[PDB]
Amino acid sequence: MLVTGLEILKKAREEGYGVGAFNVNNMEFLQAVLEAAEEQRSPVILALSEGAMKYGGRALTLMAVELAKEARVPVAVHLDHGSSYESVLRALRAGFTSVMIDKSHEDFETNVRETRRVVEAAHAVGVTVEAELGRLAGIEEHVAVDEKDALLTNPEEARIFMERTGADYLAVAIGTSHGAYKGKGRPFIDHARLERIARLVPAPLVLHGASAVPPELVERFRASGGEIGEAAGIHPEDIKKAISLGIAKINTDTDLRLAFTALIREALNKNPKEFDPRKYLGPAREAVKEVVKSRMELFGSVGRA
Template sequence: MPLVTSKEMFRKAYEGQYAVGAFNVNNMEIIQGIVDAAKEEQAPLILQVSAGARKYAKHIYLMKLVEAAVEDSGLSICLHLDHGEDFEICKACIDGGFTSVMIDGSKYPFEENIALTKKVVEYAHDKGVVVEAELGRLAGIEDAVNVSDRDATFTDPDQAVEFVERTGVDSLAIAIGTSHGAYKFKGEPKLDFERLEKISDMLPGFPLVLHGASTVLPEFVEQCNTYGGNVKGAQGVPEEMLLKAGKYGVCKINIDTDLRLAMTASIRKYLYENPSEFDLRKYLSPAREAIKNMVKHKMRNVLNCSGKA
C-alpha cells in the first residue's frame, strides 16, 4: 500500500467533525509507537517531518522507516513536511516521496506569502501532492521556528479567504492562540473560538489546521521533574478546547511536544531506577510504549478519530 495524501482524510474529518492527528517523527521508536497506536485505534494518521528532523535523521532514512511502517501496519499513512521554509525544501520533499508539504511563508508580508505559496502549490499539484500553508504567526519555539509573543499575530478572516482563493492551497494553518513548545500560556489558557468560527464560516468545507496544539500532559511533566528534569511551569492546550476546535473546521491537529515529553519522561524514569543499565534497547522499549499509549489517548480523547480510518 503506497503513502496517501490527506485530501480524503480531511474530507471525512470535516464531515465527521473530528481531527486527524499529525505527529512529528524523528527516529524509529517514535514512528513505531505512533503507528502501533493508530493501528490499534484504527485511526487516520499523518506522520510529519520538520526540517530539523530531516537534518537529524536524513531524508532517506525517514522515508524508509515510514515505508516500513506502511508495509508492516497496512495503514493508509500521509507523510507531511512540517514548516517548510522555502520552495527548495518543499521541492526536495515532493521529489523525494512526501505526499504532503507545508510551505510556511507566515513570516513574510501577505503578498509575498501568497506568491511563495502559489509557487509551491503549482509544483506540488502537478506531482499529485497536497499543500498546507500558514497565515498568521504562532508564538513559541519549535526546531527552527522561533516567534516572540510580540511578533505573534492572529489570522485575519478576510485575508484567509483571499489567501485560499488566490493560492489554491489545500489546507491552512491559522493562529488563534496556540503556540509552539511546552510553555503555551502564562495565565489561563484561551483560544479565539469566535475568530475560528468566523474563518470556518467564510471557508465552508475547507480544512483548517492547528499548530502548537500539544496538551503538555501534566503526568509527563511531573515524571520528568521527579527524575531529574527541570520542566517547570509548562502548560499546554486543554483537551476540551481541541475537541471543540474539531467542530469548527479544524481537520488537522499537530502534536510534537507531547511526544518529546512522553519519551523523555520514560527514559528519565528508567535510567534513574536502573543506573547501571546502558543497553539502549532497555530504555527505548518502554519509551516507545509511552509514545503509543499517549497517542492512543490523543486519538480517543482529543482528536476523536478512533475507528475513523
Template sequence: MLRSGSEILQRAHKEGYGVGAFNFVNFEMLSAIFEAAHEASSPIIVQASEGAIKYMGMEVTVGLVRLLSSRYPHIPVALHLDHGTTYESCAKAIRAGFTSVMIDASHHKFEENLHETQRVVEMAHACGVSVEAELGRLMGIEDNISVDEKDAVLVNPEEAELFVKESGVDFLAPAIGTSHGAFKFKGEPKLDFERLQEVKRRTNIPLVLHGASAIPDYVKEAFLSTGGDLKGSKGVPFAFLQEAVKGGINKVNTDTDLRIAFMAEVRRVANEDNTQFDLRKFFAPGMKAMKKVMVERMQILGSAGKI
C-alpha cells in the same frame, strides 16, 4: 501505499473530526505512531521538519515511513513536510516521496506569503501532492493583550478567505492563540474559537492547529518526578482541543507531548538502574509512553475507529 494529506483530511472535514499529525525524528517515534494508529484504528499524518530530515537523512526518513506503511497497510497515512521554509525545500521533499508539504511563509507580508504558496501549490498539485500554508503569527494570547495587538497577531478571517481562494491551498493553519513548544500561555489558556469558526465558514477547507500539544498532567508528573524541569509549562487543555475540532480544525499537530513522555521514561530507567546501558531497556518504555499519549489523543480528536 501512502495517501495524500487531502485524501485523509477531506474525510475528516466532511465528518467533523480531527486527525493527529505526529512529528518524528527516529525509528522509535515513528514505530510508536504506527502502533498507536493500529490500536486506535485511526488514520494518521506523520510529519518531519527540515531539522528532522537533516538529522535522519531524506532517504531514511522516507524509507522508514514506507516500510512501516507496508507493515500496516490498513492504516491511511500521509507523509508531511512540516514547516517547509522554501519552494526548494518543498520540491526536494516531493521528489523524495512526501505526499503532503507545508510552505510556511507566514512571517512574510500577506502578498509574499500568497505568492510563495501559489508557487508551491502549482508544483505540488502537478505531482498529486497536497499543500498546507499558515496565516497569522503563532504566539499565545496573554490576559492583557489589547484588541489591536490581538488582531495583529491572529489570523484575519477575510484575508483567510482571499488567501485560500487565490492560492488553491488544500488546508490552512490559522493562528488562533497557540504557540509551539511547552510554554504556550503565561496566564490561563485562551484560544479564539469565534475567529476559528469564522475562518472555517469563509474557507470551507480542512484547518490545522499548530502548537497543539496538551502536556497532560500524568506526562508532566512523570517528567518532573524523574528530575526534569518544565518551568511552569502549560499545554492546550483537552477540552480546548475538542472545542477546536468542533470549530473546524481537522489536523492537530503534536510533537512536544511525545518528547516529554519519551524522556520521562528514559530518565526513569536511568534513575532506577545506573548500571543499565542496553538501549532497548530505555527505548521500549519510551515508545510505550508515547503510544499511550497518541491513542488518547486519537480518541479525543475523534479519529479513533475511523479505519
C-alpha cells in the same frame, strides 16, 4: 496505506473529527505512532520537520513512506513547517504526500507568492499542501479592533489567501502560543474567530502549537530529574470544540518528546548497570505510543479508518 494529506483531512472535517499530525524523528517514534494508529483503527499523519529531515535523513523518509504504505489505516507523510521551495522539492523527492510551506512571517504578498509556487509544484506531482496565515495583513484594510485581533488570522483574509494560493488546507492563528501571538498572552482558542474562518474557508483547517502537556506528564518528567517551565497547554475541551468547528489537523510533538525523555531518565536513573539501548528506549517508545493513542481518542479518530 499511503494517501494525500487532503484525502484524510477532507474526510475528517466532513465527518467532524480530528487527525493527529505526529512529529517523528527516528524508528521508535515512527513505530509508536503507527502502532497507535493501527490499534485505534485510526487514520494518522506522520509529520517530519526540517530538523527531522536532517537528523533522520534517508533512513527516516524511507521508513515513513514505506511503512505508511503497509499500514492498514490511511497514512499521509507530511513535511512540517518547510522553510524553502528547495526543502519542499526534497520532500517531494522523498515521496511525501503532503507538504507545508511556512511563510506566515512574511508579508501577505510574499506569503502568497511563496505558497503558490509550492502549490504548483506539489500539485504537479499529486501532493497536497498546507499553507499558513497567522496575522492580520490589512489587505482589505481591516483595522485591528484589539491587540489580539491584530496577531490572529482574519477570516476574510484567510479566504482570499486560500483563493490565491490554491493551498489544500490552512493553518490559522486562533490563540495557541504560535507565531505572532507567541509569548503574548495565555494559551487559548478563539472559537468565535475559528467559526468565522471556517465559514469562509471550507478547506480543512490546521491547528499549530497546541499540545495538552497534561500535569501527570510534566510531573513524571520532573520526577525523572527533568526540568521544565510552567508549561501551559490548550485544554482538552477546547481541542474538542475547535475540531467541531473545523480543525481537522492537530500538530503534536512536545508531549511525545516529554514522555520519551521521561522514561529514558527513569530507566537510566534506576538501572545504572544497563547499557543495552533496547532496555531503556523500548519502554520510552511504549510511553510515546500511549500518548498518541490518547490524542486519537481526544481527537475522535478512533475507528475512523
